[PDB]
Amino acid sequence: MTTSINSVVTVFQNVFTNHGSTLLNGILIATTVGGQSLVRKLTFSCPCAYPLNIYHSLVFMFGPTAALLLIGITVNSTTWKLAHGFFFRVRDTRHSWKTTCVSWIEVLIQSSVAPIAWLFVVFLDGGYYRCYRSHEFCLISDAILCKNSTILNSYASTSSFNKISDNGKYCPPCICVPNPTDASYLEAESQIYAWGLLLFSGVAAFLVITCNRMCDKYTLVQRQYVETYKNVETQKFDAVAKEHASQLAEHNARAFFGQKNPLFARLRLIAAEKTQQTMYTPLQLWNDNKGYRIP
Amino acid sequence: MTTSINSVVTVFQNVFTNHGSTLLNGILIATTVGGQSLVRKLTFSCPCAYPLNIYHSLVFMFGPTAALLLIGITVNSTTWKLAHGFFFRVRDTRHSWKTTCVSWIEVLIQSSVAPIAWLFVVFLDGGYYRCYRSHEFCLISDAILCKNSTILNSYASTSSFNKISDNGKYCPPCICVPNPTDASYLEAESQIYAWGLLLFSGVAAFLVITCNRMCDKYTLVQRQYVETYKNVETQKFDAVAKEHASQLAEHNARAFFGQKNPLFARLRLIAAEKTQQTMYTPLQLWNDNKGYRIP
Amino acid sequence: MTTSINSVVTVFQNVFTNHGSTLLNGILIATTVGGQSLVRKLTFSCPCAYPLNIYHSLVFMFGPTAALLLIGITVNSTTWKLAHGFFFRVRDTRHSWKTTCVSWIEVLIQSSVAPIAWLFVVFLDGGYYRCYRSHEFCLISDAILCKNSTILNSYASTSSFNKISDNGKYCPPCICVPNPTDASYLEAESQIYAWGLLLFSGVAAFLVITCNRMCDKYTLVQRQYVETYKNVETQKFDAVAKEHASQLAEHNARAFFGQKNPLFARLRLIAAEKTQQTMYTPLQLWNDNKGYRIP
Amino acid sequence: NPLFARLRLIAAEKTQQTMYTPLQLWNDNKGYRIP
């Protein structure tokens, strides 16, 4: 199933080079799927225990989701433009409660793209979901008794049998390997939960990013121009900041080997803005407010 | 069947580099078919259950169709030019009810190219359709009884046989693997449904895109010039918007390190227009209406 | 498990080329993981002794952590800017007690990135943690008696058996290889401790580097400009120092084959500074204080 | 450019400050604080 999902990686590399909502993290998601298909070639360590099988399945599922959710927050620039130095903002430059929640849900969804994709990848594998209800099916309270004292584990594996003892309640190696009828049943149960999660996330994400492209105040040419102007001023401003710091570092380095902007400007110079005026991306709005009235 | 359909992918790469209706998504469709032939090299997980086999077949068929239909909507530009910010259009700039349905059916067909192609690819495989009426043939109500309690599954697989028990009503492994006579019969049943769907879609699509190239008001040289002018102004306008935002970001970045267009224009600047006048693609029609009378 | 974690190395090479806190050591960490996956292909020497198994496991875990912690200190520049020549600083140029602890915790966390990653890599292997409680499970006080005199080791391996003698308290080869039920149990115990450590470190590191990006005085554009100015003056100052020493070495080399700056400046020229004034990175603050008043 | 800028942009000035020729003095007073 590795080369199949790698071909799917090439397909959605073509997708994340075509379009989407944004594309700041489309490089990393396809590399995660294309590398962790080959990880899933060597997985399901899948212990033979009552609590540790649920732990090794539940942690291994809902752990990298939280990890990639945290990475999708922290790498995403806009949340830092919301909350880089939230304590020491000069007052009334932090903007609102309603708009900051819209930006918060924006960065949450742009973050949560990648963990939903990873969850769909592993649920789409016949993997750690069989390692979950392979436990939860096996009637395992006698293996609680078997692991109260490991002498019972030894004499349940060796003296009494394992699959001949499939009558009552079971001790371990049903856990690490089930019946292949049960294994295939629960494997495709994982496949249908995988596609149900993917289709639910796709429909809900389509509906949300449509309802924030259909309730958008600006319209499609005006929105493409605001996005082009945003994407050019947050590069041209950085190029001018770099050459300004480079000249003032040139002169201050020459200043040493020849011996022998208030917070209001640096805070109106920061986005997560209102889009209610003809000017926007509040470098413009600061510039209209204070000096240098027009360019 | 993988390299065969990959050769078909190369053939229809030549086709989608020759002609068609449009070619904005012809790159991705051939990559989907050429990668998911190799996906179909490793498929039919195909569970041994009464409801889950129909679920794992029906979801796996009609799920990626809806997913690629949603992708074919959202990637396609024209529907956003219909409905990017449909709430906050300045009134009477949204145009009609009849013309917007023509554009809606246009983006629906240009979307639905790729799911019909994917449906034909998987039906053309002997795949998840055998995984559908392999269930629906097998007389499976005794497997409902077998999966009311999995002890009956165990003693139907082990104690009683599976293919020696082909007399009455069946319990699982008929489901996961049928008789090869039945399998080949139902496989080519899937092949003839595949080609029936493809030929029906091809005839209907030919008839529709002919009846919207034969009921077209403009004629073939005038239509090729309107398409060339559209395809050059929605690139030249973006180049001028980029260099305009670049100059006004240059000057506004220099404006900060030296301290120490109403909605009517941005809405008549948007397509999904009437083609009833000598001017068209309503940047021209706006320009004829308001200032800068001729170029 | 080698190529899997090498694919993870490629993924987090993409991560450490995207973003983070800093990236001065992101080259070396991925090379450590990608090379020591292939080291872990040939590991668990794992002796058959009572004290030496715990020693060979505990030293091999908590040794390279201390080694990479020491390397992460010494390679990191900022701690030397705190304490290169701490004895012979001219007095009141060493700054405070509170701020130097903030820089100390900064260099401790930037150091401790790599040992936590290495600890997670080896705990994520089924490795030297099975080589720890494979000892601690095996009831080994009879192997203390067996290694009080190695004649008992010889007659415990040869005359009496090893796995037939799994009744009471055990002598060696249980240690070097346990029961595979126990081995897989304790292996996935190591996996869940691995992910628990990784998730705890990730949540705590996110919370700390957020609480020192949310309690930051400057804000995100001002902080990016201070970081750009810092990253350009500690290169432009070095280029001017190099060409100044090159001219004064040119002239002093010509000065020999033609025969036949107090400590205050060199100490205010050093960082780990206060960020309380409009000027910062105290080359600027020195320059404002003493001569060459402005550039 | 209001009349205040076009009037502090005009000489016959005081020479009492470190800046002079009152384009400089206007520039120090109002925006564009230093060159």
Numbering used by the authors:
A (entry chain S), B (entry chain T), C (entry chain R): 1 to 260, 278 to 312
D (entry chain G): 278 to 312
Give excerpts from the publication.
Calcium homeostasis modulators (CALHMs/CLHMs) comprise a family of pore‐forming protein complexes assembling into voltage‐gated, Ca2+‐sensitive, nonselective channels. These complexes contain an ion‐conduction pore sufficiently wide to permit the passing of ATP molecules serving as neurotransmitters. C. elegans expresses only a single homolog of CALHM1, termed CeCLHM1, in its sensory neurons and muscle cells. In these cells, CeCLHM1 forms a Ca2+‐sensitive ion channel involved in regulating the function of excitable cells and maintaining normal motility of the worms.
Here, we present the structure of the Caenorhabditis elegans CLHM1 channel in its open state solved through single‐particle cryo‐electron microscopy at 3.7‐Å resolution. The transmembrane region of the channel structure of the dominant class shows an assembly of 10‐fold rotational symmetry in one layer, and its cytoplasmic region is involved in additional twofold symmetrical packing in a tail‐to‐tail manner. the doubled‐layered channel of CeCLHM1 is formed by docking the C‐terminal domains (CTDs) from two decameric hemichannels in a tail‐to‐tail manner. The double‐layered 20‐mer channel spans ~170 Å in length along the direction of the membrane normal, and is ~130 Å in width. The channel contains a wide funnel‐like pore with a diameter of approximately 40 Å around the narrowest central region, and over 60 Å around the extracellular and intracellular entrance. Thus, the structural model of CeCLHM1 represents an open‐state form of the channel, as any other structural adjustment would probably further constrict the pore size. Each of the 20 identical protomer subunits shows an L‐shaped structure. A bundle of five TM helices and a long cytoplasmic helix form the vertical and horizontal arms, respectively. S2–S4 helices span the membrane and form the outer wall of the channel, whereas both S0 and S1 line the interior of the channel and are about one to three helix‐turns shorter at both ends. S0 and S1 are tightly packed against the outer wall, shaping a widely open pore at the central region of the channel, and the lumen surface of the pore exhibits alternating layers of positive and negative charges.
